[PDB]
Each structure stands twice: as structure tokens, then as C-alpha cells.
């Protein structure tokens, strides 16, 4: 078999990409599945969330895209036995110059991550990519390297205009760069059910997107990550929520999302 590569992408800032990418990778790993989490963002919050401070690690994902290293070396064992991390650092932001000069040659610049992942695809069950907040090069590499994509949606006004923008960026690559690219699902995040902004933003989303919302096998209802301050607390301890409070609602909801993704 070979890895399903799941990109976690939304270009809106702070909708929960890193928390989703960190906790899904951890929830998938405790099912005895081999998981590679790639911190694909220059802010490097996924790396911090697993408790690797930036100056501990020599060489990062930027140095793999450059070709100084091959991805196999830069990989770290985490607290979890089944969770591996390609860490990031702010030096990864310097890939952006390297992008517009690598599309200047072979039109190969979108695929730099995808070609880098080729050595490691038979080595993992799932590869989870944490993308930064933009539709620029790093998110495009993340999307061109992926079989499927999770969309976190903070259910607030900017998500209406914003989600729509990402789909037609996705639709663009489905007819060009990565034709096999799938929407794995829509993942309501930071969810407070009672709010009239939250109901009305979800209503409008359910008009166009309802089939693609993450749903549960055993219930049949929607999978929604609740607003839980424990999830926000967890990266301060260098941990996924699973290793912080396993009983908490947000940990429960990430383990539900694990179970959907394993099922197919």
C-alpha cells in the first residue's frame, strides 16, 4: 500500500489548521497507524505543538525543498511512537523566492513538495500537511502533493467568501496540476452551537457544501470540533489534546474525525 496524503488547508487565518493537523495526526497514530506530520508553515506552530523548540533541530523542510537534505534525515520521532514530524522554522518563508524562480524554468515549482515526498510515501499510512494562511506557493505545494484536503471552517462571516475562494483554487488544480485531488471534508472548528452567526454561516454553507461535511458512521450526525480552551492549552505542554485531556470534548471530536478517515 501507499500513503494517503491529507493537506490541512484554509487561507483564512486562525481557523484551526494547526490544531486539526496536530490532533488528527495524533488520533490516527493511536490506532497503530504510521503518521507523518509535515509542518508546512513558516510560523511553525505544528512544530511548537509537539514540543520542539526552533533552535534544537539543525535542518528543516526548507532545506529539503532546496535539496541540501533529503526528507528522510530531517524527520523526528515524537512523544508518540507512531507520530513523526518534518519540523518547520521561519527559514521556510524563503521558499517563496525559490518558487517564482522555479516556475521560471520547468513549471516544476508547484511540485517541489510532491517530488520531495516521493521517498517517504511507502513509509507512512497517512501524511498530514499543515499549510499556512494564504493561497500562495506553500499552500499550492501542499495542495499539489495531496490526495485529499481537509477544510477547517471557523463558523463566522469571512468563511462564506473565503471557503468559496479555496474551492475554485482547488477546482483549478483538479483540472490542471493534481487531477486526483479530493475534498476529504469540511471540518467545523471552534464551534459554539448557540450563536446566530454560527447557525447562519453554517446554514449558508450547508446550502452549497453539505455532502462534503465530515459526518460520523455510528451516529450519522456532523463532526464538529467544539470551542474548548483545553485544545488551546495543549500545545503549551508540547502535546496533542489526546495526551493532555483524553476525556475532553475536543479530544473526543478529534478521535471521531480519526475514525471517519480510517473508514475510507
Amino acid at each position: 500500500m501507499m500513503s494517503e496524503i491529507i493537506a490541512v488547508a484554509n487561507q483564512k487565518g486562525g481557523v484551526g489548521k494547526t490544531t486539526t493537523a496536530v490532533n488528527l495526526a495524533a488520533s490516527l497514530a493511536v490506532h497503530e497507524k504510521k503518521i507523518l506530520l509535515i509542518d508546512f508553515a513558516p510560523q511553525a506552530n505544528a512544530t511548537s505543538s509537539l514540543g520542539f523548540r526552533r533552535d534544537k533541530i539543525d535542518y528543516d523542510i526548507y532545506h529539503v525543498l532546496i535539496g541540501r537534505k533529503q526528507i528522510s534525515q530531517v524527520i523526528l520521532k515524537t512523544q508518540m511512537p507512531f507520530l513523526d514530524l518534518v519540523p518547520s522554522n521561519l527559514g521556510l518563508a524563503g521558499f517563496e523566492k525559490t518558487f517564482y524562480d522555479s516556475q521560471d524554468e520547468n513549471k516544476r515549482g508547484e511540485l517541489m513538495l510532491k517530488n520531495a515526498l516521493e521517498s517517504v510515501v511507502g513509509l507512512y499510512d497517512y501524511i498530514i500537511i499543515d499549510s499556512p494562511p494564504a493561497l500562495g506557493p506553500l499552500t499550492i505545494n501542499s495542495l499539489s502533493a495531496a490526495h485529499s484536503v481537509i477544510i477547517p471552517i471557523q463558523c463566522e462571516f469571512f468563511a462564506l467568501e473565503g471557503t468559496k475562494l479555496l474551492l475554485n483554487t482547488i477546482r483549478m488544480l483538479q483540472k490542471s496540476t493534481n487531477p486526483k485531488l479530493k475534498i476529504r471534508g469540511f471540518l467545523p472548528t471552534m464551534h459554539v452551537p448557540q450563536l446566530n452567526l454560527t447557525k447562519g454561516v453554517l446554514a449558508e454553507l450547508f446550502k452549497y457544501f453539505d455532502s462534503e461535511f465530515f459526518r460520523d458512521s455510528a451516529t450519522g450526525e456532523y463532526i464538529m470540533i467544539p470551542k474548548s480552551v483545553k485544545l488551546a492549552e495543549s500545545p503549551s505542554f508540547g502535546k496533542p489534546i489526546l495526551l493532555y485531556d483524553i476525556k475532553s470534548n475536543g479530544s473526543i471530536a478529534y478521535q471521531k474525525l480519526a475514525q471517519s478517515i480510517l473508514q475510507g
Binding site: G51, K56, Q79, G238
Partner: peptide
């Protein structure tokens, strides 16, 4: 046997 401490 986890050896010398980084991390925490």
C-alpha cells in the same frame, strides 16, 4: 532508557 534530556 531514554538517555539525556531535551524536550520536557
Amino acid at each position: 532508557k531514554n538517555k539525556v534530556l531535551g524536550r520536557g
